[PDB]
Design brief:
The chain is an alpha/beta fold and about 240 residues long. It is about 35% helix and about 20% strand. The chain contains 9 helices and 12 strands. The protein binds a molecule of 2 linked components (BGC-BGC) and magnesium ion. A molecule of 2 linked components (BGC-BGC) binds next to strand 8 and strand 9. It is classed as hydrolase.
Length: about 240
Amino acid sequence: MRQLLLISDLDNTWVGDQQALEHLQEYLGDRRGNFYLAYATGRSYHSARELQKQVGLMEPDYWLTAVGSEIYHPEGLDQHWADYLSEHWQRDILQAIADGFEALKPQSPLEQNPWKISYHLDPQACPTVIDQLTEMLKETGIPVQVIFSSGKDVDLLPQRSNKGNATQYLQQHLAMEPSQTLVCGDSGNDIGLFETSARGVIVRNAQPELLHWYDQWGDSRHYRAQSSHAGAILEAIAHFDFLS
Ligand SMILES: OC[C@H]1O[C@@H](O[C@H]2[C@H](O)[C@@H](O)[C@@H](O)O[C@@H]2CO)[C@H](O)[C@@H](O)[C@@H]1O
Ligand SMILES: [Mg+2]
């Protein structure tokens, strides 16, 4: 029932340039009832809440955390989403396989959840290892997808997950059209966002893998902003003529 569904990553997207974050929130703060806001972050819910206190993030309507593996409504965790993601998912088998790659080191326990297995790729290792990992995991027949970003972060998620799928679920939940949706990102864990039919903005300070993705799959609905961080969001809103 609103004119815009705004979905944005936090680190290096909404966050990173405090001045830009502040004028973006001031602008949005004057028409809060005109849009639904959702933060689609790689961070856990707790970590995202902590970031909110650190930089003064405005309260979103929804939180799509841990790369969309968990969705929080104003009322709490979305149990339907969790069950949907649990179907056919085999965390232990996938973990056993990933744990076997010497170039991969587990990320801290607090970065893990039932539907998210994360690692850090050795800076000295060849990125090609990610391709080998992906193929090996896929061949298990378990519906899994590999998210590689910033040249170091590796996330194993159910195929039904990732920011894009979480976004489409939210769109359906809110009866919001892709044409009324704007997704904002900066890295590989945002590619799922641009795979959707929503309008999208890639921040100027975007990571190499996202820029590479844009050069190959970039369409008319995708916008390469001149501004970095939060400034790219205001720029995109004007570009797509949202909140007319
Ligand atoms: O999906 C990629 C990784 O994202 C991580 O979010 C963080 C991190 O927690 C922050 O401290 C800051 O550095 O930005 C990162 C990128 O957004 C998440 O914690 C990892 O588990 C993910 O693999
Ligand atoms: Mg990102």
